[PDB]
Amino acid sequence: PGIAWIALLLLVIFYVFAVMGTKLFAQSFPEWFGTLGASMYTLFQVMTLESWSMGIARPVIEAYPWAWIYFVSFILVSSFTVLNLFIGIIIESMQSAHWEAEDAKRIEQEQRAHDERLEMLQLIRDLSSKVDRLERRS
Amino acid sequence: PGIAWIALLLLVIFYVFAVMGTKLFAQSFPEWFGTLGASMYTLFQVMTLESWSMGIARPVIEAYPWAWIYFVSFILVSSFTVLNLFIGIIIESMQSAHWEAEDAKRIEQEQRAHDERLEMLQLIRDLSSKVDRLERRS
Amino acid sequence: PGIAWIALLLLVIFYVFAVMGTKLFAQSFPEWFGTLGASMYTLFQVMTLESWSMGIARPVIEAYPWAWIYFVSFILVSSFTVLNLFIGIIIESMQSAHWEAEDAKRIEQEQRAHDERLEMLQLIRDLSSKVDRLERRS
Amino acid sequence: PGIAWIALLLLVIFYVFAVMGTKLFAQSFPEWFGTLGASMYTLFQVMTLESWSMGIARPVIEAYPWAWIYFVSFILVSSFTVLNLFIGIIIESMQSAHWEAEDAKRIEQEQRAHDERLEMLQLIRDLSSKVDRLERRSG
Ligand SMILES: [Cl-]
Numbered sequence: 023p024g025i026a027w028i029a030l031l032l033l034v035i036f037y038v039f040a041v042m043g044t045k046l047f048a049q050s051f052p053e054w055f056g057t058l059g060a061s062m063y064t065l066f067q068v069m070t071l072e073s074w075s076m077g078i079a080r081p082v083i084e085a086y087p088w089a090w091i092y093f094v095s096f097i098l099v100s101s102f103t104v105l106n107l108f109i110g111i112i113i114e115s116m117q118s119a120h121w122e123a124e125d126a127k128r129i130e131q132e133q134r135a136h137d138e139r140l141e142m143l144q145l146i147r148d149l150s151s152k153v154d155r156l157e158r159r160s
Numbered sequence: 161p162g163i164a165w166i167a168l169l170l171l172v173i174f175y176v177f178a179v180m181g182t183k184l185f186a187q188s189f190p191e192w193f194g195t196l197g198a199s200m201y202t203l204f205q206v207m208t209l210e211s212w213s214m215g216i217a218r219p220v221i222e223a224y225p226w227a228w229i230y231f232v233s234f235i236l237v238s239s240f241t242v243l244n245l246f247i248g249i250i251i252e253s254m255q256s257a258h259w260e261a262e263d264a265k266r267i268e269q270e271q272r273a274h275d276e277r278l279e280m281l282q283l284i285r286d287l288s289s290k291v292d293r294l295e296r297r298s
Numbered sequence: 299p300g301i302a303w304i305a306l307l308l309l310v311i312f313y314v315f316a317v318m319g320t321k322l323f324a325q326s327f328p329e330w331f332g333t334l335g336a337s338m339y340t341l342f343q344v345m346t347l348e349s350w351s352m353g354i355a356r357p358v359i360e361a362y363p364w365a366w367i368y369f370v371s372f373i374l375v376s377s378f379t380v381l382n383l384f385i386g387i388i389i390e391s392m393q394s395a396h397w398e399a400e401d402a403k404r405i406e407q408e409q410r411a412h413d414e415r416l417e418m419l420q421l422i423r424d425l426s427s428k429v430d431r432l433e434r435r436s
Numbered sequence: 437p438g439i440a441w442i443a444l445l446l447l448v449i450f451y452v453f454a455v456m457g458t459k460l461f462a463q464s465f466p467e468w469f470g471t472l473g474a475s476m477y478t479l480f481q482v483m484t485l486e487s488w489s490m491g492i493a494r495p496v497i498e499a500y501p502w503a504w505i506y507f508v509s510f511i512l513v514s515s516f517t518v519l520n521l522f523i524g525i526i527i528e529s530m531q532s533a534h535w536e537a538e539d540a541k542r543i544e545q546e547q548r549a550h551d552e553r554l555e556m557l558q559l560i561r562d563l564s565s566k567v568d569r570l571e572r573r574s575g
Pocket residue numbers: none
């Protein structure tokens with residue numbers, strides 16, 4: 023049903039990484055990733071880029087050196103998504119202010135145009151064939 | 161009357177979360193929430209995503225393990241309300257830029273068109289008279 | 299020349315604060331505000347919203363309790379200004395992608411339609427007068 | 437092939453500053469800029485504006501007093517270039533909301549009307565000829 027198609031995506035990326043993070047990280051870092059609810063919080067703060075590296079990820083990379091992939095992949099993937107709601111909402115907003123009625127007004131203006139142009143077409147037909155007759159007598 | 165309609169909702173979402181803040185946290189966290197004014201500055205801090213979690217929320221979450229609702233929800237509400245204040249401005253910005261005129265220049269263009277098409281409904285109607293006379297005059 | 303109107307303004311606000319700030323704070327907080335360049339770098343850092351409070355503002359507010367006006371006002375005002383520079387660039391950006399090019403077709407493609415109607419006006423007019431030199435040459 | 441054009445401009449700016457940065461800073465700040473890999477992470481971190489100053493910049497400018505240029509300039513160039521990516525997406529978004537479609541809805545529609553007019557045009561000519569001959573046959 024539109025934007026909330028992406029929202030649902032965001033919740034899902036969250037859930038995937040929150041689980042991924044609790045599996046990978048819970049033992050060695052329990053306060054940040056000890057439970058799945060814990061990591062939902064951490065990823066929230068990470069997603070808002072708050073001390074994500076200096077206070078959460080650079081620490082985690084010391085234990086697990088390859089774990090920048092978790093953190094950089096999430097910033098990348100979650101930002102791109104958050105971006106879209108912002109877009110998907112900008113757009114659908116423009117649409118209500120404008121596009122919705124713009125297409126409508128001009129669909130309709132062209133009905134008028136077309137109908138006028140239609141009338142002319144007949145008159146020229148009636149006239150066309152008056153002249154048709156008149157010439158046949160001549 | 162447009163945007164300061166929301167930009168006020170902002171001002172009261174602030175005022176509420178700032179009283180709720182002081183009542184709840186004033187006592188363990190005096191510096192941050194000790195007084196209503198002290199909590200505004202703190203949420204102004206929080207709203208800008210400045211150190212909100214490592215600096216404030218997680219320490220508050222240490223004392224009141226539920227507090228994250230207060231913090232996560234403030235961010236959702238204030239970020240959004242700010243989003244709208246923004247769209248509202250991006251949109252009314254497009255209007256004056258472009259939709260103002262494209263809408264109007266068009267009404268104009270298609271008056272002109274309509275007039276011309278009327279013009280010749282006329283001749284054609286008149287020519288249908290002349291030919292209508294040739295027929296009776298025979 | 300458009301947005302670069304505010305771009306100039308932003309720069310003015312920036313510099314007025316870097317001076318308003320070196321005058322107020324440089325005595326007591328030299329590393330942050332000691333020289334003008336010093337304050338500028340720190341106000342750039344405050345503009346990027348980075349450690350603006352837990353880092354710089356809070357410690358300055360505890361010498362100079364009133365000093366929140368400075369950091370809150372600077373963020374508010376400079377965010378508003380960057381907000382607009384941003385919109386102005388979207389507007390301007392999409393004036394190019396589409397709107398300029400669209401109005402170029404809407405116009406030229408109605409030159410076409412107008413011209414077409416003008417030709418049919420003449421034809422009906424030329425016709426309208428043979429049909430009435432019949433009315434006279436009989 | 438579009439903004440991907442611009443995304444490539446960004447990846448080039450990283451590369452340049454990550455190398456300018458590892459050459460410049462790896463002796464004194466090995467953790468941050470020790471190796472290219474290190475240096476990029478650090479720059480991605482600066483780009484998200486995460487402690488770029490209190491955490492990374494100000495410490496280095498302690499040691500190399502002029503390095504405010506490396507950091508300030510990277511945040512501009514780096515950030516200004518990510519803006520154009522954000523616009524570019526914002527645009528190609530509308531292209532496919534609307535512009536794509538309304539743009540061509542109208543091409544179609546003036547075919548609809550050009551074609552009509554063309555028709556009327558035919559008939560009026562046709563009528564003229566009929567008047568032409570009516571005219572001659574009777575002179
Ligand atoms: Cl538009």
